[PDB]
């Protein structure tokens, strides 16, 4: 049961917030679980999906694994390499079947200066909570 009275529990307002969200909120809402192997190494549970990661898909009719070529933030979907619409011609181009990030599990992460730091920032706060508890 909720206790905070500045937070809506109204379906109409909650649905309006899923749409019409700004771009920084939409990125966070497109997260996925890290694999067990990365959970031990990084000590984090989920991560926001990104162009350049490798994902293992389940629960769908397009199961498989591949790299993230595109992010359709308006749709909350991601295009993976190798997961296409079944095509008509033998020659014609591939057409990506778009996957929802929560149907995925990340197997390897794209790394740069900002992604190392935001992980380390998130571990130190999760250790504040583990000291309070």
């Amino acid at each position: 049961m909720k206790l905070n009275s500045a937070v809506t529990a109204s379906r109409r307002k909650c649905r309006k917030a899923y749409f019409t969200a700004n771009a920084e909120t939409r990125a966070k809402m497109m997260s996925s679980r890290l694999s067990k192997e990365l959970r031990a190494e990084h000590k984090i549970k989920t991560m926001p999906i990104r162009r350049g990661d490798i994902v293992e898909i389940f629960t769908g009719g397009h199961k498989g694994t591949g790299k993230v070529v595109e992010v359709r933030r308006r749709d909350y979907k991601i295009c993976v390499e190798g997961i296409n619409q079944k095509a008509r011609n033998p020659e014609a181009k591939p057409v990506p079947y778009p996957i929802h990030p929560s149907n995925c599990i990340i197997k390897e992460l794209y790394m740069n200066g900002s992604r190392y730091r935001a992980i380390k920032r998130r571990q130190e706060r999760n250790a504040e909570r583990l000291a309070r508890i």
Binding site: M1, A9, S10, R11
Partner: protein, 211 residues
């Protein structure tokens, strides 16, 4: 609503019915016209509340508490009490903070099947009510009544469970649906202060027992 437009009757002599019409001839301003007002609009001055005397409010709580001391009326209200030691069920707990420990007591006594009865019943309701913030329904289980011990943190999350401090007992909790016989889990200090509570009501005597 319905009266922001401008409309007047055309009168007889033009082969049309006599209701008010907008410029152009469109029907307006009647309950039988598209876009018109209601015949008698709803108003907030409806009397929403009702009065009850203080004597009759105390009778209802006492009669609803007496129903809770029968194992045949609790059963016929809907609960599962076939594995319970006593239906006037008093239990010594004295402090409960983890839900895991509080689940262990309710099992350790025999009210485990009533909370699973409630847990496995959650569903989406049948009508328009699921657009109006009333989307799910669960059945109602035990009521824990406490006096001086922290139990609310460990009991509250359980499906179909409610919490009452003994000094202020609620009739809408004792008779869900307007049916009297709820199953009640008394803490020891709650059950042993019932008479003190009824002694704290000034110039009140309980009603006379009958056959």
């Amino acid at each position: 609503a319905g009266v922001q437009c401008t409309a007047h009757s055309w009168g007889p002599g033009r082969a049309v019915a006599r209701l008010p019409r907008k410029h152009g001839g469109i029907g307006a301003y009647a309950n039988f016209a598209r876009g018109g007002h209601m015949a008698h609009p709803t108003t907030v001055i409806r009397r929403w509340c009702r009065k009850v005397n203080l004597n009759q409010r105390r009778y209802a709580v006492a009669s609803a508490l007496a129903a809770s001391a029968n194992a045949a009326l609790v059963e016929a209200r809907g609960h599962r009490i076939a594995d319970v030691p006593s239906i006037p069920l008093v239990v010594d707990t004295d402090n409960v903070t983890k839900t895991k420990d509080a689940l262990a007591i309710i099992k350790a006594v025999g009210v485990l099947r009533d909370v699973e009865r409630c847990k496995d019943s959650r569903h989406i309701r049948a009508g328009r009510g699921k657009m109006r913030n009333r989307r799910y329904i669960t059945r109602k289980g035990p009521l824990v009544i406490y006096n001086t011990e922290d139990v609310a943190r460990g009991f509250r999350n359980l499906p179909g469970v409610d919490l009452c401090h003994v000094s202020s007992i609620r009739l809408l909790e004792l008779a869900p649906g307007s049916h009297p016989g709820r199953l009640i889990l008394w803490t020891k200090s709650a059950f042993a202060s019932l008479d003190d509570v009824y002694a704290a009501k000034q110039n009140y005597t309980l009603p006379r027992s009958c056959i």
